[PDB]
């Protein structure tokens, strides 16, 4: 029996609809990513998703079929029990630009990036554009290309679009990201796929020095409809530990969390608690270390947490420092063209008073402005920020036909 551990990795998956993200994570996990009811019936990625798997290699066999996720080695036919490499995490973005913006939340938590490509769709595809350039934003340039639908493409058009792949990477930071043939529904060589996720995407250097912050992505209530008052629980609040480490029964404050009317204006409350338990799914551990979306069940009220109220929450210590500011100064860098769309028009130097969407790592808000400096922006909000230190990645999107697409990547100066 594998001696249990919590993950070490995050691999957020980006790409458009029909490019093959749902069944590729079905393929690397054994389970799916479309986790809502109207989603269940309609069939489009609506949730910022998540996924987990194990890795055990059989040292005896050839390259590579050893990498399958159970304590056995007869996928490649090896008699041995495999050596363990890690338990893994894949964070699942939407495809549509009618649902693009929100995804940038999870982006602040990827130890890599995955782009899936349509090999039965001409060049260039609409939303993979925006996905890959937002990756270029998040400071995680680690990309995993897959050319998908090797089972409806002719075996030459695949090669032409493969050239187109190596080319699309030329001229962007990802000249040195792979191209491995696997596909979504047909599980074709997902094994050397995980081999490539291991070989090409390395671990980003972990550090336990700054304040341990879990930049949340999900938050839910365990209590089933009709749960008696005796086995009642708090809420689960779920992120991953990038700086530090969190522990069950630990004093913590969550931010922003709860909003309250204090002195006639609008303001929030950073909320103290301790953790009721920690887990990644269905195994028992007690103190979350770096690696993977960890779930932290707390001592709060559950109604505070259901229906993704604090989407992109942050957790740090109730004796710690992360600021909140209604007026935020952000140094912003303009995007070069309309990436994720059919149509790409010029990027205009604007004046203020326009209403733009500013997503703070895993946080998000609207904003307007009065002084529009050349390089930075002084934006007024309705809800304060989650900014653990300098120049954290908050992104700006402007409306395009109801699709809020990127117009710059900004870093928060405080």
């Amino acid at each position: 029996a594998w001696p249990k551990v919590q993950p070490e990795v995050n691999i957020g998956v980006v790409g458009h609809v029909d490019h093959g993200k749902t069944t590729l994570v079905q393929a690397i996990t054994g389970i799916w990513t479309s986790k809502h009811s109207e989603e269940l019936k309609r069939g489009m990625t609506i949730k910022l998703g998540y996924a987990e798997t194990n890795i055990g290699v059989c040292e005896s066999c050839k390259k590579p079929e050893a990498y399958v996720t159970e304590p056995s080695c007869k996928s490649c036919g090896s008699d041995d029990e495999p050596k363990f490499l890690r338990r893994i995490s894949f964070i699942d973005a939407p495809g549509h630009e009618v649902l693009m913006a929100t995804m940038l939340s999870g982006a602040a938590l990827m130890d890599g990036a995955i782009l899936v490509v349509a090999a039965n769709e001409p060049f260039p595809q609409p939303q993979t554009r925006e996905h890959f350039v937002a990756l270029g934003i998040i400071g995680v340039k680690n990309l995993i290309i897959v050319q998908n639908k090797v089972d409806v493409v002719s075996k030459e058009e695949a090669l032409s679009q493969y050239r187109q792949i190596k080319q699309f990477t030329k001229g962007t930071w990802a000249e040195n990201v792979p191209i491995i043939p696997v596909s979504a529904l047909h599980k074709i060589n997902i094994d050397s796929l995980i081999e490539g996720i291991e070989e090409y995407i390395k671990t980003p250097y972990r550090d336990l020095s700054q304040k341990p912050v879990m930049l949340v992505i999900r938050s839910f209530d365990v209590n089933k409809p009709g749960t008696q008052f005796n086995e009642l629980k708090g809420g689960v609040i779920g992120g991953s530990i990038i700086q530090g480490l969190f522990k069950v029964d630990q004093e913590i404050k969550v931010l922003p969390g709860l909003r309250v009317e204090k002195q006639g204006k609008v303001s929030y409350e950073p909320i103290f608690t301790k953790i009721s338990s920690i887990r990644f799914g269905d195994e028992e551990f007690k103190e979350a270390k770096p690696g993977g979306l960890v779930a932290i069940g707390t001592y709060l009220d559950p109604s505070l947490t259901k229906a993704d109220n604090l989407l992109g929450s942050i957790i740090t210590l109730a004796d710690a420092e992360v600021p909140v500011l209604w007026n935020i100064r952000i140094k912003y860098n303009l995007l070069e063209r309309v990436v994720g769309a059919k149509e790409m028009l010029k990027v205009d130097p604007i004046r203020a008073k326009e209403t733009l969407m500013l997503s703070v790592g895993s946080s998000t808000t609207l904003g307007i402005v009065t002084s529009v400096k050349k390089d930075e922006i002084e934006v007024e909000l309705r809800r304060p920020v989650a900014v653990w230190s300098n120049n954290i990645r908050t992104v700006i999107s402007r409306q395009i036909a109801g699709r809020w697409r990127m117009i710059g990547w900004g870093l928060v100066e405080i």
Binding site: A352, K353, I368, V369, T370, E380
Partner: protein, 36 residues
């Protein structure tokens, strides 16, 4: 509002009460609206 009572006469215009109320919805604004 430093009334000027030549306007209520309603001759070739609109009521005054329901214009005051609408000027408030813009003074409250240019005061709040990034007039900081």
């Amino acid at each position: 509002m430093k009334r000027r009572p030549r306007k209520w006469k309603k001759k070739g215009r609109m009521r005054w009460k329901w214009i005051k109320k609408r000027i408030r919805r813009l003074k409250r604004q240019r005061k709040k609206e990034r007039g900081l």
